[PDB]
Amino acid sequence: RDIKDEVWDALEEVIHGKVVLLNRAPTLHRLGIQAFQPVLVEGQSIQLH
């Protein structure tokens, strides 16, 4: 409840420019991990390219 709208607008500033890492189940090679700029979304699920 206590999360007010402009919390999220605040976040979008935060993460500008910086990336996160995605990792998938068996990291068999150098590429089970790659870097992405996150774009925030509603819902629960991760969006893979």
Partner 1 sequence: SKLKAPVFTVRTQGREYGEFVLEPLERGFGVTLGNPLRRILLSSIPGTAVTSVYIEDVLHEFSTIPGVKEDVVEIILNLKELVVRFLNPSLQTVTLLLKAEGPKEVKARDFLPVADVEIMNPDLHIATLEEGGRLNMEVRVDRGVGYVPAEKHGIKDRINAIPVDAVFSPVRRVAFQVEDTRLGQRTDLDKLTLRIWTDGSVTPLEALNQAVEILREHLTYFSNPQ
Partner 2 sequence: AEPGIDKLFGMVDSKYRLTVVVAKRAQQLLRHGFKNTVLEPEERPKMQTLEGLFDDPNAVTWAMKELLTGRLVFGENLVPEDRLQKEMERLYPV
Partner 3 sequence: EAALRDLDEEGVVRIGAEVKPGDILVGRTSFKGESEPTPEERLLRSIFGEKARDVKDTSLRVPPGEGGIVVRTVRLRRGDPGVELKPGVREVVRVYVAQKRKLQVGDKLANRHGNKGVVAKILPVEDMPHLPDGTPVDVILNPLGV
Residue 13 makes contact with partner 1 by CB under 8 A: no
d(CA 4, CA 32): 36
DSSP 6-49: HHHHHHHHHTTT--EEEE-S---STTSEEEE-----SSS-----
* Residue whose CB is less far from partner 2, 1 or 16: 16
Taking CB within 5 to 8 Å according to partner kind, which of partner 1, partner 3, partner 2, none is near residue 13?
partner 2
- Name which of residues 28 to 47 contact partner 3 (CB under 8 A): 43-45
Interface residues with partner 1 (CB under 8 A)? 5, 8-9, 42
